[PDB]
Design a protein around this ligand. Sequence first.
Ligand SMILES: CS(=O)(=O)c1ccccc1-c1ccc(N2CCc3c(C(F)(F)F)nn(-c4cccc(-c5n[nH]c(=O)[nH]5)c4)c3C2=O)cc1
Ligand code: NA
Ligand code: NA
Lengths: 52, 234
Amino acid sequence: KLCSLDNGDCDQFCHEEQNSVVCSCARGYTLADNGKACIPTGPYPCGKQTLE
Amino acid sequence: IVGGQECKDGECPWQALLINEENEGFCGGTILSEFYILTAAHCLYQAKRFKVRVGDRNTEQEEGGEAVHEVEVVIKHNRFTKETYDFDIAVLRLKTPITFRMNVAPACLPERDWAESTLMTQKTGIVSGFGRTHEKGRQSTRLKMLEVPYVDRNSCKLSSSFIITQNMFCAGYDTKQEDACQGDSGGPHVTRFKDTYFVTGIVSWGEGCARKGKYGIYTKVTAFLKWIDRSMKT
Ligand SMILES: CS(=O)(=O)c1ccccc1-c1ccc(N2CCc3c(C(F)(F)F)nn(-c4cccc(-c5n[nH]c(=O)[nH]5)c4)c3C2=O)cc1
Ligand code: NA
Ligand code: NA
């Protein structure tokens, strides 16, 4: 299943390499230590509503 | 936007408004970064000289966080033609960078395969704009948004009098009388994925607005990611 199973548990981009899930993030985000979550590098990261 | 809801504070921060010499909004745009706006190529024929308004939600009131940006470079797709409305995409490079703040933030550009398998396969996307609130009407003074179901590609082709190319996609309702309209052109169609909004479309055209058995036609952003990436380096 990999990327077809809940986006491979990635926050954002899910890729398949050697029958394994590889997560990546858009610009302005850094991939977290767990290699799944995407952390904003600074204020106003892309795609976030400014509700606060 | 016909129907839908007003964009509340901080809800549609990627929305840009193209304004003519008379300071009236005529098309939308999407903030991609501090120097770049994504819009429709056909919007560039709607005004001789135009500027970009960001952080604007109400065109009657000055919003403080609201700013006017001049266009330095217009990057228009050479393949666009009024006969087909194919390749309805343009990138604008601004003279000064946008200050991101409440109501001003870029939408994410997804990667092609993931957008197609993951974003495009979600039930819905969100279209927003200052366009007409009824097929026959004036431009809205309020920024509106509307959740629009992704429309099956076959149903899309059958619904239309015109050729739906591979650079286009349908979204909207068959019966429910809510859709994007004139003046929303160039604006965002974004898809939410785990609380992150990715730009998936550019309001392109439609046969009327909110007509039964008809849909909003969007430029498919995935078909132009390399061209967009390239435009941002130049
Ligand atoms: C050039 S062509 O050879 O015809 C051709 C050749 C080949 C392909 C397309 C075309 C083509 C057909 C119709 C149009 N037109 C027709 C008139 C109109 C009006 C109106 F009615 F307000 F005037 N609004 N509007 C508009 C604008 C933006 C969104 C929506 C929308 N989104 N969702 C939804 O339901 N509507 C509606 C249009 C529009 O796109 C423009 C071009
Ligand atoms: Na305003
Ligand atoms: Na419809």
